[PDB]
Amino acid sequence: GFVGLGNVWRFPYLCYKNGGGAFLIPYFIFLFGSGLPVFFLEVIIGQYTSEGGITCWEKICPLFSGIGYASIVIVSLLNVYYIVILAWATYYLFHSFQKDLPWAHCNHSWNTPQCMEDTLRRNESANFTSPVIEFWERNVLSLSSGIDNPGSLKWDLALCLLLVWLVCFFCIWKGVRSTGKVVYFTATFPFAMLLVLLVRGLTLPGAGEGIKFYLYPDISRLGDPQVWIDAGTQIFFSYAICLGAMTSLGSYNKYKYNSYRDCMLLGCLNSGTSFVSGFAIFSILGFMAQEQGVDIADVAESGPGLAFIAYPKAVTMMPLPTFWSILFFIMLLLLGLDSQFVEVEGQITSLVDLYPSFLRKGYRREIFIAILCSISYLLGLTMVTEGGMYVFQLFDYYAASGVCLLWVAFFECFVIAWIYGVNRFSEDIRDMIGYRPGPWMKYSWAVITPALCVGCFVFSLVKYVPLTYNKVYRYPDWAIGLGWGLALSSMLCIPLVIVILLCRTEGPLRVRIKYLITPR
Amino acid sequence: EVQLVESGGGLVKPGGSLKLSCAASGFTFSSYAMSWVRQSPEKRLEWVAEISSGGRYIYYSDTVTGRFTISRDNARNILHLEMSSLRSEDTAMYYCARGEVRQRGFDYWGQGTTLTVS
Amino acid sequence: ENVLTQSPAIMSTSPGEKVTMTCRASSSVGSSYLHWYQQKSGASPKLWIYSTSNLASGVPARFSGSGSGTSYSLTISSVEAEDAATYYCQQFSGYPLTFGSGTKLEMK
Ligand SMILES: [Cl-]
Numbered sequence: 001g002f003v004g005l006g007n008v009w010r011f012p013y014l015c016y017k018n019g020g021g022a023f024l025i026p027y028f029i030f031l032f033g034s035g036l037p038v039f040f041l042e043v044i045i046g047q048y049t050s051e052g053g054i055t056c057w058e059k060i061c062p063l064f065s066g067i068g069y070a071s072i073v074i075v076s077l078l079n080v081y082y083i084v085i086l087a088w089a090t091y092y093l094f095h096s097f098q099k100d101l102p103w104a105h106c107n108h109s110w111n112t113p114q115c116m117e118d119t120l121r122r123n124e125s126a127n128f129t130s131p132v133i134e135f136w137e138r139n140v141l142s143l144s145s146g147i148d149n150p151g152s153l154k155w156d157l158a159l160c161l162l163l164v165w166l167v168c169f170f171c172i173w174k175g176v177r178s179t180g181k182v183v184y185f186t187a188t189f190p191f192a193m194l195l196v197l198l199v200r201g202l203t204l205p206g207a208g209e210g211i212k213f214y215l216y217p218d219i220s221r222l223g224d225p226q227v228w229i230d231a232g233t234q235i236f237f238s239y240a241i242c243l244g245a246m247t248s249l250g251s252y253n254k255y256k257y258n259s260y261r262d263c264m265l266l267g268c269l270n271s272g273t274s275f276v277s278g279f280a281i282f283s284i285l286g287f288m289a290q291e292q293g294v295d296i297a298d299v300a301e302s303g304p305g306l307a308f309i310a311y312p313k314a315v316t317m318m319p320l321p322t323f324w325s326i327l328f329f330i331m332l333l334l335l336g337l338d339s340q341f342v343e344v345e346g347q348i349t350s351l352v353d354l355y356p357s358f359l360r361k362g363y364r365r366e367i368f369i370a371i372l373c374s375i376s377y378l379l380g381l382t383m384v385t386e387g388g389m390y391v392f393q394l395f396d397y398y399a400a401s402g403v404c405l406l407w408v409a410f411f412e413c414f415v416i417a418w419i420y421g422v423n424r425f426s427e428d429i430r431d432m433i434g435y436r437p438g439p440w441m442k443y444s445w446a447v448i449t450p451a452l453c454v455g456c457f458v459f460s461l462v463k464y465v466p467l468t469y470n471k472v473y474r475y476p477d478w479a480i481g482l483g484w485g486l487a488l489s490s491m492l493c494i495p496l497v498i499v500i501l502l503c504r505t506e507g508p509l510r511v512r513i514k515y516l517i518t519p520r
Numbered sequence: 521e522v523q524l525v526e527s528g529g530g531l532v533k534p535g536g537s538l539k540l541s542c543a544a545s546g547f548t549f550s551s552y553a554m555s556w557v558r559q560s561p562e563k564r565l566e567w568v569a570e571i572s573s574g575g576r577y578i579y580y581s582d583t584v585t586g587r588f589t590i591s592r593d594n595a596r597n598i599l600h601l602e603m604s605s606l607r608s609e610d611t612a613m614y615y616c617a618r619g620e621v622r623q624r625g626f627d628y629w630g631q632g633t634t635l636t637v638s
Numbered sequence: 639e640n641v642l643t644q645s646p647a648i649m650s651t652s653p654g655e656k657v658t659m660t661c662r663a664s665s666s667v668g669s670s671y672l673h674w675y676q677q678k679s680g681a682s683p684k685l686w687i688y689s690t691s692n693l694a695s696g697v698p699a700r701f702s703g704s705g706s707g708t709s710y711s712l713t714i715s716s717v718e719a720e721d722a723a724t725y726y727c728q729q730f731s732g733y734p735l736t737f738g739s740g741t742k743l744e745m746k
Contacts, residue, residue, distance in 0.1 A: 623670045
């Protein structure tokens with residue numbers, strides 16, 4: 001369950017968006033200084049406090065109980081755009097049943113006169129566009145000229161979104177999840193498919209330059225603020241470690257259960273899966289740049305279509321493309337459906353824990369599933385429009401993988417270390433795990449993760465650069481404002497809860513602070 | 521060098537009280553959980569009580585679960601063991617044992633103070 | 639309680655002989671939490687083997703430990719005159735922490 005679209009889809013395009021080589025240095029810096037400490041942190045908070053989500057910050061500093069509300073906002077927005085990823089994957093899966101895949105050859109209705117098939121491009125020398133980018137942008141995306149031009153609601157993307165939301169409704173509380181078929185399927189089938197796509201990509205001609213672009217850093221790119229924050233929020237994204245999902249996972253664990261080796265195994269496996277998927281996709285992109293005669297950084301989308309360009313293009317250069325296209329997009333749907341089952345189950349669980357007996361279990365709980373799925377549908381219908389990828393990129397940069405993740409991780413590490421105490425928390429960990437954490441975890445919660453999150457947060461503001469889609473489209477200022485509103489809807493869940501809890505507690509400021517930072 | 525020095529060893533009446541005092545040195549006392557282990561005169565080791573590093577999580581054996589009280593002094597590095605309702609079958613040889621990692625066990629033990637019931 | 643029934647206390651073995659001693663537990667110990675202590679005659683116990691295999695500081699390499707779950711074993715490759723003491727096995731996972739019985743190694 002640490003394998004998913006955040007590994008096989010998000011880390012490749014975030015690496016491609018940030019120059020490839022220079023993305024990995026803040027990636028590993030955040031993975032070691034920040035990401036695995038916060039992973040162990042929320043798993044321990046979910047294990048210590050027997051509940052999770054909001055009411056786990058009741059025996060851990062009740063003043064900062066807004067971390068749960070921040071996680072609820074984050075998981076709602078993540079549910080919306082992560083299910084529209086699944087809608088794109090379903091649209092590709094239904095288009096995979098053709099013998100000749102529509103992104104393989106050049107003569108269709110959506111293709112421009114500037115089309116050329118990929119193997120023919122090196123013979124002709126330059127304003128010539130590959131069929132994978134053409135199929136993506138003008139059949140799947142049906143991409144408009146901006147977010148201020150939404151175009152029209154594209155049909156059958158809404159039907160793919162309806163299919164994946166009906167599968168989510170019929171498998172979360174009207175049904176069950178995978179229990180006995182987890183062996184040899186849905187746990188190693190994505191790893192097998194990643195192995196197949198990796199051994200395809202590494203044996204491709206010209207794929208050495210793609211690995212060179214992937215691994216060798218650009219030191220001048222490390223001074224960009226976007227690289228550090230993209231790497232940090234990619235670590236916090238693929239771990240889902242500002243989400244409440246891992247806190248809810250720790251609630252379904254025993255008290256004296258060893259959850260250190262499990263956490264570092266899951267985190268290192270997740271980051272290694274991301275690294276292997278990056279190897280695969282960037283080898284495919286090196287092959288693509290070799291074939292098309294264009295630069296490696298300009299061969300495909302510098303946005304969230306890289307897994308929908310590089311992987312389908314490698315499926316075309318594979319024996320029997322139809323079979324592997326069907327298996328690959330069923331794999332994408334299985335990864336994203338498992339992660340969406342986990343996150344919608346966590347959102348539903350923490351929302352009915354937020355209001356007990358306002359939603360009774362049984363008849364009215366089932367109505368609440370339909371209500372929340374319908375609301376996330378109507379918020380997801382602005383992403384299957386013509387200009388729906390711009391809304392999606394706004395969500396992916398801002399809603400659940402931006403300064404909100406840095407804010408929640410910094411506030412969790414700060415609350416634990418400097419209000420709850422690293423020594424008191426280590427005493428709790430010793431009582432549960434068996435040993436108190438070493439100086440790595442202690443000084444990461446105390447120094448390294450607050451310093452990294454605060455430094456990248458201020459570095460993304462002093463040298464502010466606007467969000468750009470595919471390196472060419474500058475976003476409008478109202479779109480940046482809407483994305484910042486999406487970020488601040490999670491970010492302001494902490495100080496609004498602080499102000500509310502200070503207002504609802506009587507006494508002077510010192511007495512209120514003392515009552516609300518002493519645990520219950 | 522880790523040194524655990526015990527005190528308070530003496531003869532007490534049944535149903536009485538005694539103050540044991542494990543004075544530790546050579547290590548930070550606030551970061552290691554400490555335990556009292558007694559040894560019966562027929563040489564049978566028995567863990568009595570464990571206190572955590574901060575003094576918050578306190579565990580007791582089934583024999584002494586309601587009449588023994590273990591506490592620390594993290595400022596001056598002394599572990600205590602208060603006693604009351606001390607029955608006849610409590611004459612033993614009491615060691616203070618430093619066990620913080622549950623997978624390392626009691627790596628450092630103390631010196632010997634004898635409790636005698638008569 | 640997790641009663642650790644250990645090998646009988648009175649074992650008499652000549653020096654230089656490979657010896658072993660068992661430690662059966664009533665419950666199941668997680669095999670990273672069972673430790674062995676060597677208490678000499680009239681002296682305090684000291685940590686000898688921790689996490690059922692690793693060797694404590696000042697312990698020679700001739701001692702070794704094995705076993706998991708229920709049955710746990712301490713093994714001496716060759717016995718010398720400084721190995722004449724009582725060995726207690728000790729789970730330290732379950733919160734009523736229990737030591738084993740005696741296993742006193744006397745000479746011949
Ligand atoms: Cl990742």
